[PDB]
Design a protein around this ligand. Sequence first.
Ligand code: ATP
Ligand code: ATP
Ligand code: MG
Ligand code: MG
Lengths: 455, 262, 258, 48, 276, 503, 138
Amino acid sequence: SNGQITAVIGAVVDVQFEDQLPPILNALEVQGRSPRLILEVAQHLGENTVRTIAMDGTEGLVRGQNVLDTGAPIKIPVGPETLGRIMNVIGEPIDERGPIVTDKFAAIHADAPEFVEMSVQQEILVTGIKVVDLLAPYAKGGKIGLFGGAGVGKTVLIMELINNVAKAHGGYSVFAGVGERTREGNDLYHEMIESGVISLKDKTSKVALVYGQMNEPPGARARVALTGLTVAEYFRDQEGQDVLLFIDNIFRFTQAGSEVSALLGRIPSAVGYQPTLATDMGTMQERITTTKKGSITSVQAIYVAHLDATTVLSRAIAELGIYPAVDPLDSTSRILDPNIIGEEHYNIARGVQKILQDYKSLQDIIAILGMDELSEEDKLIVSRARKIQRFLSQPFQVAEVFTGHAGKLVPIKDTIKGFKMILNGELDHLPEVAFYMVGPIEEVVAKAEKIAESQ
Amino acid sequence: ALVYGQMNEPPGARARVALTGLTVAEYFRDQEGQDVLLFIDNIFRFTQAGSEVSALLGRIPSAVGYQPTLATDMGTMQERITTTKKGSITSVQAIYVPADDLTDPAPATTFAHLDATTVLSRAIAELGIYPAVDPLDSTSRILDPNIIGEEHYNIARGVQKILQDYKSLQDIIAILGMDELSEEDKLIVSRARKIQRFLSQPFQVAEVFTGHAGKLVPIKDTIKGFKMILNGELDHLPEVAFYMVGPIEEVVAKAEKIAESQ
Amino acid sequence: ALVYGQMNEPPGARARVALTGLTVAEYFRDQEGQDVLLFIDNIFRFTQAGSEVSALLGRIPSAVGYQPTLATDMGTMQERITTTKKGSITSVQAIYVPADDLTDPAPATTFAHLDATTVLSRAIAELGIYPAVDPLDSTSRILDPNIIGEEHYNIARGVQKILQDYKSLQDIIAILGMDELSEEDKLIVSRARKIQRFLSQPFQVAEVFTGHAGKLVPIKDTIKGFKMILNGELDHLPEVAFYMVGPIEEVVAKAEKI
Amino acid sequence: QSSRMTAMDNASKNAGEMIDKLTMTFNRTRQAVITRELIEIISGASAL
Amino acid sequence: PVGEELLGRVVDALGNPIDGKGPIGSKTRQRVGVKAPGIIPRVSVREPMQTGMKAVDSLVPIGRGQRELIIGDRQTGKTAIAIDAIINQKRFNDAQDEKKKLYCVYVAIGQKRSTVAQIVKRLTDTDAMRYTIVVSATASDAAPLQYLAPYSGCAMGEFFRDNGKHALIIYDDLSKQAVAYRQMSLLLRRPPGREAYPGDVFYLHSRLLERAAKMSESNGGGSLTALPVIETQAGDVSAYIPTNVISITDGQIFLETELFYKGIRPAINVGLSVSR
Amino acid sequence: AEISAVLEEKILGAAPKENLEETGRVLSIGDGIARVYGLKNIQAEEMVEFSSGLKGMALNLEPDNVGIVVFGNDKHIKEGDIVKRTGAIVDVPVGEELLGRVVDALGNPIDGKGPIGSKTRQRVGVKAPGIIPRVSVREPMQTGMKAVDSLVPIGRGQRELIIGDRQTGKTAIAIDAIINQKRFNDAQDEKKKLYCVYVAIGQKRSTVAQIVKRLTDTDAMRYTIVVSATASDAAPLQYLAPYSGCAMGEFFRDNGKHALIIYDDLSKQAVAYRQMSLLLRRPPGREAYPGDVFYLHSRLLERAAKMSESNGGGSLTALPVIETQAGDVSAYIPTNVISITDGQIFLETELFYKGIRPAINVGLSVSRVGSAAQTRAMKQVAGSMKLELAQYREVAAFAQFGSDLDASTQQLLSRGVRLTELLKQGQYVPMAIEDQVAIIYCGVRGHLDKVEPSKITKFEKEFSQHIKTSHRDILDTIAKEGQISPDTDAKLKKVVTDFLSTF
Amino acid sequence: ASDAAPLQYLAPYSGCAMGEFFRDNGKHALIIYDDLSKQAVAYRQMSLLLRRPPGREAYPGDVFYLHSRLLERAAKMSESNGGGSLTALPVIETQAGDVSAYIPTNVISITDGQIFLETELFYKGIRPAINVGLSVSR
Ligand SMILES: Nc1ncnc2c1ncn2[C@@H]1O[C@H](COP(=O)(O)OP(=O)(O)OP(=O)(O)O)[C@@H](O)[C@H]1O
Ligand SMILES: Nc1ncnc2c1ncn2[C@@H]1O[C@H](COP(=O)(O)OP(=O)(O)OP(=O)(O)O)[C@@H](O)[C@H]1O
Ligand SMILES: [Mg+2]
Ligand SMILES: [Mg+2]
């Protein structure tokens, strides 16, 4: 179970064993490194030596150095103790908050759930965000693409997703910064501390963080998502919770897998990390699914291929004062079918989308000729569409100290009822500005009554 | 005689099937003194099978993924298709052009050994003219007043010029009409319609499916007929008398029957 | 002094004859303290003959089948051609671009080793303008308002802006013609065509090719003529009068002859 | 109306000629890209 | 394993049952690499294989014994077209006409296992499972299983073809099988070609798709109908694997992303859809 | 190792007395790569000394031999020569004594001004700071040019890329940023100072001499270190020069001071590392580059950050330069550096020859720090300026053939023309922040809509003189308040209207 | 076309030696290589079968040297060398009239002038279809 280093070429270490050869994906610890170096066995070369990828730096290694085989893959600490902490690939805490004292360790390479363990019903994960729950619903076990650039509240939306899932459903979240910048990671960590999702000394943390820097070797960044998925899998299997898994991002995960394949020299650089091919990404994608015990819902943070849902964040929506700045027309979902989410939900969503598209055409017509067109029917359409656009906005729990508005959690039935009443014109006599920054629809009625009493 | 190397065959069989058919044709030429016909369909599948054979041997591929021996493999296959002192082998080869690129190495290698061209046009088939051979896209290298003769060359050039004038005037007729054209233009478009109607011909092998008896028009009959149409000697006949008729005596006979039935 | 190793020579000889001419110029510069003129024609044959033997030296080829030490060999060759404190060398080197490509590694390496560049284009030579110098691809690093004069720099930048505007308009001109252009665009096109004709100049060595007498144009006459064209003082003249003439006085004389 | 029809006809003919030249350039660029990627894959595989 | 005991069962590429309903009772086993039928044992394709879609049954008709390609981008409706073709045969299999009955095979290659479970639920709900075999090689399955699953499903269909019955097989999708074979060929140190694909990916797909045929009346009169699926990226028809599959099959059905986002469902491009 | 001498001494059991643990002999030497037998106790990335006095670095530790990259001409190295390990990795001197000096990649002075009295040396392979010791970037790093200090702002501790084609002005942007800091280094406020490091990689010696002459004539050399790895230098020197310059800048960053590093250019370092990797028989990848060429630049550029107040508060802002061939930013090295850095500044040849200098493509240039890297007045005027420029670009995308346009469209087009003429700036003349704020404020408040654009530079040449002579109290009010108050806005509008009446 | 590639490569040099006989004996010889593009294709096949590194359009890097060492032997001798001469007329087949390709640009740089033939003029009956604007002689 003890081997010696034969060759050191970049982040690729060839290590020769004597008695027992470790299997593929096992972790081997170098015995002379003060920051310990874990090598993952990628292939067997024969002659009782194996080729391994390094999870840390390689400068200073000498040939013949002793390597101890752990007899298992990279076992990272899992549990409630990893909430609010930052871990590297191999589970060491890198937030200078002390050791991670836990009782549960789990290997980062596990099997996907079987064909009999999967639910035939394509349930949706309601997240309490009215625009998300209405126009682009989140499916349990689905793949979710979160778009947005600089100046938009993409980070605030991510933290609102974490807080709302931990509150409404009781399931935690895991963030995995696959090859992320140190400045962006520090900003995200401090924003998570400030907004109260990560709490120090109170044990009320809702997200577990796994980070991989850009100065890390390619092998280290290609297994950060596996570490985050392992923490999420502990929260799903051993607790029965619906767990969010934020990955930043799939593109950098594919890039790190392509760099690993280029270092190993077998697969050429033209082919890197297909969504299929369980060695590359098929196991990771199939371990993000909904089972009879729980579900893992993957959200990929994309900064501006197989996404079940997509929420596009636009600067123009934030320029109109609508928070969150989700574009209602560019946010699509495969789940928008009458056979899955119900006929009334699809009918309301299609009516809202049609009203918004007609409103954009009416705004173009008004900009061309003027505000008087097709009697008062177009004016009524414009008024209902503007009330819908105001009602799409919602205060955030995580941003109640930066904006001063108390965030609210809106169930899906409340959003359906409120938008149905707006479409039917039951609240058409209320002022437009009374529909702004309100969670439920009874809050809209109370806001309109307070406006009428004040004015 | 048929060979039919299928698409599920190994690449070696598909590469040598053209040589097998060429060997049967070479026996018909050398040991019988015949003018054999060889049909290859497709000739791009021959190149693709040769490329797969060379890639299975581990050789370094040439430009655009083809074998480095593409020119000499095509040359060795095609130089056995020639005319010798005993007989001749004439090859009609179906040609597929990948990605509609005539500068691709496989069509460009094929075009070096080509002595003619027969383009079958879908638009001509939509006009009811059979065979649907495009008279302008199809070309030949023996269009010369030393191989086919002065009269054949002049008549073919005159037919090509009239059809080119017709194609130029088709856009004008489509956008404006036909009444504003001059008398010369109306004579040109009438002769061109009669020329392109006379290009149609009944085939014996389709005579069950068509009901028209097939005709084998000799070359002097086609030369005389198109010379008559070019000179305006049949300006009084209707255009429908030229359709699906082999010779020109049957054109005037069909015109006489049309006049009598009218 | 002449040193010749030509294209009939083997690639070993063509890769070292430039160093022989450099050695003659270095002796005339250092050990004598003289002003030397060094003309090389052409550098690309040196850097191509270096690549012809690179495969026979057992080297891995570089991108587009070049020698992997092309940059370092060109650097060690070109750094010997310099003006030192002991003496001055003015060097004029021709460079060949294979298949009319400027992103080829050998000219792209040679670009950073030069002070003044004169890029010749085939498309300009197709238009009959001789010398076919690209006006928007030639740099000198002496083109500075504090070195060659403020008026000279301003005229040169104005000519380059006019020719860039004409190049941007050429896409619309090639489709919709001159009718869709505005009046300022027509003035831009007319002055740019006059500028392109006036950039051509009959050379004394090229007379046997053409028959025009070669003209030597003083730089004050050059900046005066281009200032006259940029100011619109010659908009009433045909552009053919601007073709193959040295000074602006020959432009006026040729216009009056027509 | 006649002048506008003739002007749009000339514009369409000029656009057709530009389309033909860009199509030839596109085919040449496509062949060069395929050849370059094949040579890069060959050089990557032959270094093992 | 082959037989009619596989109808209604969800099996993997090896034929092992994965639906949890118990072992299969097949008495016959058929090789996956069987040579395609020749020229004499087959006749011309004339029996209509009715998809049930108006645009397919009118503009690009599919006959019994024909390879018709369903090519398109992601999320365009290729699986929906294939599932509707499977569902449409219920009205023929219930009737007494033996020449109208069609037995279906659905080979899911490289898909998500939850999507295959939803497909099986949909076919069970519409009573189309009784004549359908589902062969699933998901993403978590190994690349050899994804390479083998089309040939396993083809052998199951060829049992019906050689027994006088008629079968329709769907390969959803063949691009995932080509990716799996590319990875196996690269890890076996085989010489690659364009896009690191080996020199016999065309031979792989041609020997797969030449087994769909209309047998002669002296050879039983049965038929096997293939509906391969190709997923393209940004409409790149000129890619290597789509070019090979287009050159193999007897026609293609093009699904357009632009038409799909306009709400035109099914998004069939009429000018690009060919049926020989 | 199976050579004839080794087989001879192993068959006979000679047991040779040469202890090759701390020394070695050269098996082969070629093109700056030495394969060395011996050096049993050598470590990776360690410096060695040859018998001719040349230095080398051990990059490949193979079981048979050691691969050494030679720091100099390989003519001095012969087969069988003795190589002695130094026992330490490469280090360079750091300190305030390097300011004003022109050094090579190893810290040796090449300006001829004698030695350097540096009392401290730092290794080049230092790990980058983690997520904890660094803080968010908010201090402005003022380049001094209006097109970049407003639209693509650069903060202290930010990796901002300058990417473009040849002869577009990337070096001009960098040198102008170095020159601009003389305003702050000559002042008394210590936190505003910025010490500069310029790393020339692969350039000719005449170009570096011209750069040093330009910095000496403008008195910017007194706070500037120039690290030179010229074209005739060895590939290990060109590869190691950015790391040595980064260590020199990290001395200022770790001592509570602020440093700015320019790598001109990282494309030459990538070419040099590609040559070393190809000659070491490492497996090539896309465009013959190794698989660690992303890790090379990421490791270099991750060390440029601003430290927290507990770590002294110092900063290190990097300005890498990338040369692009024919505008193809989809190549390997441009894609890597774009994915590493916190934003890019894109330069275009068409904008350069159109008169727009600096030729900054506003649409393609991003700054991820954004308005946090700006002062309050510059943020106030640039927020409106970027919106007006975006509106101008949107309305000019469909205004080539448009003549009878709308009045609002014509106003937007005219405003965009005024702003485009406003962003133009001459070479070697950096501008103060107050002058940029005043000129941009006049541009975006409609004060130049009635002014011909060709006179705007002359207006810039004169109105800045007007407020600096007769209306300096308004500038003092702006400096003390820190923002454009509406009363100061009205006073500035009155001054502008009076000046335009005089104009 | 049915011969081996080395024979196609050797034939221009064999003919050049036969013309060099008359060149060195005071006589005058005119030699025509129809065509050098097919010789370069044969030499490309020889180099690709020798596993030599391909360059522009998968051609070896000494194809310029191949044509230059062939065509430099055609020259005008002095009176002290017998007054002989050898005149070369190389033939190049282009694709779609592109003179910007690798081999045509090589032979243009080697030779003293070209006679360009246009397909457009050839289709209009202008024979010989010589482009006067492109065909020059130095
Ligand atoms: N004719 C149709 N009418 C309505 N919805 C349809 C239609 N065809 C497909 N859809 C819907 O479009 C979505 C995607 O279609 P489908 O999954 O069948 O396409 P696909 O090409 O198989 O996608 P993928 O590439 O993800 O496998 C589904 O939600 C499906 O319900
Ligand atoms: N803003 C400017 N105004 C006027 N001239 C300028 C400006 N910026 C650069 N130039 C001039 O443009 C030329 C090239 O610019 P510069 O050398 O800075 O570009 P570069 O990116 O360094 O190019 P290279 O690839 O040669 O290093 C020089 O003559 C310089 O004087
Ligand atoms: Mg599908
Ligand atoms: Mg520069």
